[PDB]
Structure 1
Amino acid sequence: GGTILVVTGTGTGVGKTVVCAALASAARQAGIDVAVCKPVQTGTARGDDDLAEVGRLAGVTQLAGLARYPQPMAPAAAAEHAGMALPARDQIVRLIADLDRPGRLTLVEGAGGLLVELAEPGVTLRDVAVDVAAAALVVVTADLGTLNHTKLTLEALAAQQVSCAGLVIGSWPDPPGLVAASNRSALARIAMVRAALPAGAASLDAGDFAAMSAAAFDRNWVAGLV
């Protein structure tokens, strides 16, 4: 076995996907082999595709997925809209265990938040993390309300003994503002803030994104993940 992290967020559009790519890119430049798994992808009608973002931004090639639904809804609703079911629990857990190998960092990106339905029936990214014995990296905002949502996600993780590998602020504004600066300090009091990615990093070309990513995390911590 290697290291499996689920990358979850406190909500939708907090930057989980940019974080997966950024940590992927930071680990790759540390000589770590990276694989990213997005079991369920929604919003394909408008072109959503988080694995292709990670491939473009970070250059991961081991990019694995099981289902893609057209509508920009939560997985369960997008599936009912399409008239089809979510994939089964065993599919996603086994896909991830099969990605896992010594010396490799495997990131599992969910859909929205920790407790959204990912597989039939009612199984979540938390259930999946329990099954593969993964730790969780939690992507937060620096905006108003983040302390509550972070604490809630962290309590839900710990309730099922899913270790917290730290926080990442998905989007750090420029200029910060009084709320973001206050929240960042307050976030660090409840868990390790591993990085804060600058707002707009997802528009960067691959070379600029690698530079940002290498600077954004601590070199020792990334190397220490595997």
Structure 2
Amino acid sequence: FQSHMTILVVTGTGTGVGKTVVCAALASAARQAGIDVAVCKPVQTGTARGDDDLAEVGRLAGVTQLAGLARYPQPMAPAAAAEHAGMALPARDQIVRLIADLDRPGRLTLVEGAGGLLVELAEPGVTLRDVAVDVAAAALVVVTADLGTLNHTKLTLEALAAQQVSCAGLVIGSWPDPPGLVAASNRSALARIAMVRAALPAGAASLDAGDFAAMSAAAFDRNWVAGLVG
């Protein structure tokens, strides 16, 4: 049996691709599968505009094990948000510790990044990619089905591979109904580049505890969710 937690860093090809709702949905599916979930957001910016990804995940999925660290008021890159506040970025070891303290046998721990993969989270130039290497995490990458997604996905996967960070698959953060030409062909093209784990219905974030759990359980292959933790 597995004596330690499975760690996934949940990154995105950019900003506003749906990382938070994806963390919530995977947490919900895993919880319904009988797996204990912790969600972790080591660096949060935009707190002065109300942003709070951990609180949204608690709302959406009913997750109680929520682990935060740094929060910066302005909705910018951590470096700039920290500077604007007259604060500093956390150290690399603080982020790693925040994650490692969550360790339980057979737990699934989701670590949500701020923006995309190479955003600086700690000094100097420490990114979510470095953190994933420190903790031996795999990366789940949230993508859109919009024009431009194929270049961003491939850039992101190449950067994971460059530091031997394993790819857990793609999740389409928002999937339109009905899907247009571009969206439909993008979903097929994305599925040639990597496994597409889920494509969450557009508007999922505005669902409600009951419907969100139902959406979440239908959205992932149960065989993949089941295998996450042993």
Counterpart in 2 of 1:153? 156
Q: Structure 1 residue runs of 4+, over 3 Å off?
A: none
Contact 1:140 1:169 in 2 (8 A): yes
TM-score by length of 1: 0.98
Matches of 1:177 and 1:157, distance apart in 2: 30
| Deviation, structure 1 residue 151 | 0.4
The match for 1:140 is 143
Shift of 1:195: 0.2
Gaps of 5+ in 1: none
Q: Structure 2: how far apart are the matches of 1:70 and 1:207?
A: 32
* Shift of residue 43, structure 1, vs aligned partner: 0.6
Task: Report the Cα distance in structure 2 between the residues aligned to 1:82 and 1:95, rounded to whole angstroms.
Answer: 22
> 1:179, 1:43 → 2: CA distance?
32
Instruction: Report Cα offsets for 1:128-182 as digits up to 9, x if no partner.
Output: 0000000000000000010000000000000000000000000001221100000
**Structure 1 residue 121: Cα displacement:** 1.7
Post-superposition CA distance 1:99-129 (Å, at most 9, x none): 1221100000000000000112210000000
CA distance in 1, matches of 2:177, 2:72: 34
**Matched pairs, number:** 224
SS class of match (2:193): coil
TM-score normalised by structure 2 residue count = 0.96
Give the deviation of 1:204 after TM superposition.
Answer: 0.6
Contact 1:138 1:168 in 2 (8 A): yes
**Unaligned ranges ≥5, structure 2:** 1-5
Task: Note if contact 1:19-1:168 (Cα within 8 Å) is conserved in structure 2.
Answer: yes
Whole-Å separation in 2 of the counterparts to 1:157 and 1:124? 11
Shift of 1:97: 1.2
RMSD: 0.6
Percent identity between the two aligned chains:
100
2:29 to 23, 26, 31: 26
Matching of residues 36-55 of structure 1 within 5 Å: 36-55=39-58
